[PDB]
Ligand binder design. Structure first.
Ligand SMILES: CC(C)(COP(=O)(O)OP(=O)(O)OC[C@H]1O[C@@H](n2cnc3c(N)ncnc32)[C@H](O)[C@@H]1O)[C@@H](O)C(=O)NCCC(=O)NCCS
Ligand SMILES: CC(C)(COP(=O)(O)OP(=O)(O)OC[C@H]1O[C@@H](n2cnc3c(N)ncnc32)[C@H](O)[C@@H]1O)[C@@H](O)C(=O)NCCC(=O)NCCS
Ligand SMILES: CC(C)(COP(=O)(O)OP(=O)(O)OC[C@H]1O[C@@H](n2cnc3c(N)ncnc32)[C@H](O)[C@@H]1O)[C@@H](O)C(=O)NCCC(=O)NCCS
Ligand SMILES: CC(C)(COP(=O)(O)OP(=O)(O)OC[C@H]1O[C@@H](n2cnc3c(N)ncnc32)[C@H](O)[C@@H]1O)[C@@H](O)C(=O)NCCC(=O)NCCS
Ligand SMILES: CC(C)(COP(=O)(O)OP(=O)(O)OC[C@H]1O[C@@H](n2cnc3c(N)ncnc32)[C@H](O)[C@@H]1O)[C@@H](O)C(=O)NCCC(=O)NCCS
Ligand SMILES: CC(C)(COP(=O)(O)OP(=O)(O)OC[C@H]1O[C@@H](n2cnc3c(N)ncnc32)[C@H](O)[C@@H]1O)[C@@H](O)C(=O)NCCC(=O)NCCS
Lengths: 159, 159, 159, 159, 159, 159
């Protein structure tokens, strides 16, 4: 059979933890669609278009990975992609179970499947990544060199 | 004896999960006062007056339920209502135990009693409800038809 | 109205934390029935009869508190006592939510209400109490003097 | 592609919660192998052979589900089945993350994927199921009629 | 040996819970540096300078306690103080483990050590403290009299 | 100043996670006493004497680490060692906070300090280690070669 899985997120920016999940999920499912949510309410540091370019630079080499943005409901993005799985990361839960439970009513034949990144990525926080970068600290332990470049450029252009 | 219980919350808007707690709590206590907190700091989607009308439309049929707003301290609302119980919902906790623990010093003879909604309401998040509704998605699985109407009207009037 | 609440537990032995919950719950409900579960599978340190005497010595002075044992299903003990509330303690949950959720199917009109003991009793563990007492350490910070006597006698009679 | 997933567990007995996970997982993966672990150390109420018959009676109608026992390491059962996924249930975690984390070292190309059962099965505990059944209470809300029969027979034969 | 420990935080304002940790940590380590983080992003109620004065008024009597502000990276504040320990409070964790885990990469020879305040301070929330004070409620159960004065003055000057 | 810290545990057997905590704690405190608890009630796989030899083989090279057994109360072992700190590991808590909270009453001037092992050891479970070893699986990812030898010998001698 052919199974498409969606991995949605704000990805502000894509971290080594997100990337590791992408590697892992994409070896299981036929197609893995990385869905970059507009996330207007969260006031993301990078624009949607920047977040797509960031993610594409890191992920473009995976042959069965598509990176796409969405501005609307996850329901509509999942159906559009003929997807029967939503992948989400769990690190060692409030939000995730609510989201999954509500998606059981909104997308009744879609399965949310929780995956866990490698040990070394378990403790990466996006908020802490952005904060460190905005204070001029390097986050190359947490994001790829291409992403660090984007962070440096945006912080410099902000100040 | 006569026991009045207060069930306070932002209720932005009242969900089927809140409503289920109201049903359950009001069959135990003589009077159940639903206290709608102004919650100015949270920047609620609906105004206090709208949140009261919303809640009254859903709850008015329960004979021992009162719906009232408050703009001040919970302590003052609880005393005003001669209440010896504060009801709060727990779903499967940081905030709730802090709030209860601090209320043990502020309201020493008042008992916080935690109740849990039916299975089907365990995963409803208010934040997700508002977000879905603001993106034009229906939330009738999570709120009553009267509440969906309010949501549709406010989203239309916002845009 | 008249509301009877059951507070069930193994109580091996009744701690200051259990006692504090009893005080608190019994000021709210008309009758509070402390239900001592036989708990055969847990292999309790004290026998059921000893656990009843222990609890009665501590609680007998509360006029609306009954202490009773049960060897069967909680369902049958709750119905017998015309109870519409089960009180359980929460300290800062796996077991408690499963138990409550399963009781929603077994006892559909009964409400489980979770209460939290005073600050100073939040960290008492029964297992640690028994272990300390079995090693000859005093647990008077955690159980009343009458209970310490029972513990000392049983540990001496064991060895 | 062809993806085999293993869903291992003690299954003492298979509950409606396990069954729901099986339904869900087996609509995603090509083959879903239910692995019944011997679990000698847990002293299971039913024997391995009984647990297999129990599970087969409930699951035999699913065309891509295999029910098999294993007495050895999960590693060996997973490899035997050419499986690249281990499915595990999460309800609203200590054990599960340890198990998954240790399996990342033991089975480096195998992905543990956590799934969550429908709302109505979120609160079923196996321990509580067995305890109720051993006290003569019906657990038909928690296990299928075929499983209730097995429970009744074993409890009667124990006493 | 000589061991300096840093206890960093927003301290908006210093509570009795923070103060208790300071007392406890400073009896173990030779020097305890209380690091007041600028925390611009959190939009703190008090300015950095106010938060330093607040903390100094309460803590100045401890002979081996230094109170200092920092506007940059924790890494730079920790190195500046020749510190090999970061002290953090735990009450009965998401943020704290991420922060500690990320600090293992940023400060590889520095140990994060988690301490827990006395029972009576376990449930104090800073957010609730500020909210109560902004509504005109007294928080003397949660902060020292000197801190209550600062809160009263700032709330009066805000309105 | 001179500060002795105790790190107590069952250590059945000492894992790479325990060892990492020992390394970390012993670079901070002047003396680190590893206290091997008899733990009779837990029915440990190795005897106390075996657990001491196991731990000494791994830890003997650390100059400020002492490995000692204790059969009585932790209180008595801590006082004997003039210790003002108890070190405990946290991985990403019920037991640990109860233990610490009860120790606040039993050892009022002693501080429990929680430390967290490196990323790669966060998911090691002792129970899973023993179970794997008893089924004939290698646990060299989780324990040092010297410990694997002990495990192999004991499993062979059991069967
Ligand atoms: C954006 C959505 C999907 C939420 O994703 P989120 O903002 O949490 O993405 P984020 O970039 O934070 O992370 C992406 C995923 O990886 C996980 N993750 C975070 N850090 C790590 C790490 N170090 N390792 C592994 N995984 C991680 C996150 O938990 C999440 O599962 C949600 O807002 C959404 O779908 N909204 C769209 C509109 C809608 O329909 N809303 C209703 C949702 S029910
Ligand atoms: C508004 C208060 C009470 C907090 O309530 P909150 O904003 O969390 O209300 P909310 O609408 O989110 O929910 C109401 C209650 O139902 C619970 N709940 C939420 N979702 C669900 C669900 N699906 N099912 C059942 N219960 C639920 C909430 O946990 C809460 O217990 C608090 O801010 C307050 O009392 N402030 C007033 C001023 C004051 O004195 N502050 C000090 C407080 S100690
Ligand atoms: C005995 C029952 C009720 C479980 O109770 P338990 O053994 O956990 O009792 P225990 O003595 O440990 O504690 C009693 C209550 O006080 C709570 N508690 C424990 N410590 C403290 C403390 N320091 N402060 C406050 N509360 C506390 C416990 O969480 C529990 O809520 C359960 O086994 C039962 O009801 N079985 C009877 C047969 C049956 O029908 N089984 C099905 C149950 S759904
Ligand atoms: C048996 C194993 C897999 C553990 O499974 P466990 O005993 O927890 O199975 P159990 O019957 O309890 O449940 C099966 C699965 O469904 C989950 N589950 C439990 N209740 C529910 C419910 N109501 N709804 C959904 N899922 C549920 C469980 O969490 C588990 O994921 C483990 O012991 C094992 O694999 N051992 C074999 C030897 C080995 O290699 N050991 C090392 C393991 S790393
Ligand atoms: C300010 C920092 C340290 C986070 O601290 P935080 O804002 O949580 O401080 P806060 O005042 O809330 O509390 C201080 C400490 O005491 C703890 N605490 C809170 N309440 C209590 C209580 N009642 N009892 C005991 N401890 C408590 C907090 O958990 C925290 O450990 C963090 O933002 C930081 O270090 N930033 C600086 C720049 C940087 O390098 N960022 C990267 C961090 S990895
Ligand atoms: C033995 C004691 C200390 C409890 O220790 P425990 O049995 O949990 O030890 P264990 O070997 O499991 O682990 C030792 C420590 O390292 C931690 N740890 C476990 N795994 C890991 C890991 N992978 N990485 C880091 N730390 C870990 C444990 O949480 C514990 O903190 C306790 O029983 C005790 O002190 N009893 C003695 C008598 C007494 O006075 N009892 C009262 C106690 S209040």
């Amino acid at each position: 059979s052919m199974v498409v899985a969606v991995y949605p997120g704000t990805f502000d920016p894509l971290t080594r933890g997100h990337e590791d999940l992408v590697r892992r999920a994409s070896s299981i499912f036929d197609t893995l669609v990385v869905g970059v949510a507009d996330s207007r309410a969260k006031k993301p540091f990078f624009s949607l278009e920047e977040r797509l370019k960031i993610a594409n630079e890191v992920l473009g080499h995976y042959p069965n990975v598509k990176v796409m943005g969405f501005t609307g409901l996850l329901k509509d993005f999942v159906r559009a992609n003929d997807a029967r799985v939503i992948v989400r990361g769990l690190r060692a839960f409030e939000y995730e179970f609510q989201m999954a439970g509500m998606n059981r009513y909104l997308l009744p034949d879609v399965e949310t499947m929780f995956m866990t990144p490698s040990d070394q990525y378990q403790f990466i926080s996006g908020t802490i990544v952005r904060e460190i970068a905005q204070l001029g600290g390097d986050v190359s332990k947490f994001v790829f060199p291409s992403v660090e470049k984007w962070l440096t450029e945006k912080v410099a252009a902000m100040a």
